Amino acid sequence: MKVGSQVIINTSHMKGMKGAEATVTGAYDTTAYVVSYTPTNGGQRVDHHKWVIQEEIKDAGDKTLQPGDQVILEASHMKGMKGATAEIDSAEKTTVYMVDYTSTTSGEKVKNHKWVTEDELSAKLEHHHHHH
Numbered sequence: 719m720k721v722g723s724q725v726i727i728n729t730s731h732m733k734g735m736k737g738a739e740a741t742v743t744g745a746y747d748t749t750a751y752v753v754s755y756t757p758t759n760g761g762q763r764v765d766h767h768k769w770v771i772q773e774e775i776k777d778a779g780d781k782t783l784q785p786g787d788q789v790i791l792e793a794s795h796m797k798g799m800k801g802a803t804a805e806i807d808s809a810e811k812t813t814v815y816m817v818d819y820t821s822t823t824s825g826e827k828v829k830n831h832k833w834v835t836e837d838e839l840s841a842k843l844e845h846h847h848h849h850h
Contacts, residue, residue, distance in 0.1 A: 719815060721745050724842035727819065727834060731768070734821030735831070740839070743830060744816030748772055750833065751783060752808040755791065757798030764799075766807050769814055769833035775804075783809060795832075812836060 719725055723742045730736040748771045756763040770791065772778045777789035787806045794800035814833035821828055841847060 719745065719813075719836070719839060719841065725815075725817070726840045726842060726845060727817075727838065728840050728848070729838035730834075732821065732823075732831075734823040734826070734828070735819055735834075736822070738819040738822045739842070740815075740817035740819040740831070740834070742815050743818050746771075746814045746816070746833075748814060749782065750810040750812050750814050750835065751775070751806055752810065753789070753791075753804035754807055755799075755802040755804035758801050758803075759798040761798040767804075769810075769835065770804070771814065771833070785809060810835075815839065 719742045721742050725740050727735040727738050727740050750769045750771050752766055752768045753770050754765045774793045775789045776792045783806045785806050789804050791800055791802055791804055812835040814835055817831045817834055818829045
């Protein structure tokens with residue numbers, strides 16, 4: 719997808735993104751990860767959480783984090799996430815997009831959503847067209 723393009727989100731982290739029309743406000747070529755962690759502030763263990771990238775993580779060090787490696791998260795997408803011990807479930811080479819969508823569950827306007835992949839998106843022009 720190109721920056722400025724319209725796309726329809728099929729697979730989604732938020733329910734308000736499934737069937738939603740997003741706008742690609744950024745396109746990033748970085749190493750993406752699926753991590754599992756227990757929130758240090760006394761929260762329920764977030765299993766197979768995605769997406770977190772190389773510059774999202776301290777203990778990354780610009781090296782390839784292998785399945786089974788444990789790292790600490792510098793960024794936070796929610797309350798209790800930063801400072802938690804995460805373990806690499808899967809290492810991924812995908813194009814990750816920053817998008818603007820309307821949460822279809824409520825009707826609320828959300829911008830700069832991070833991250834969504836080529837797998838999780840369908841094109842506005844080429845609708846139904848997935849690459850597997």
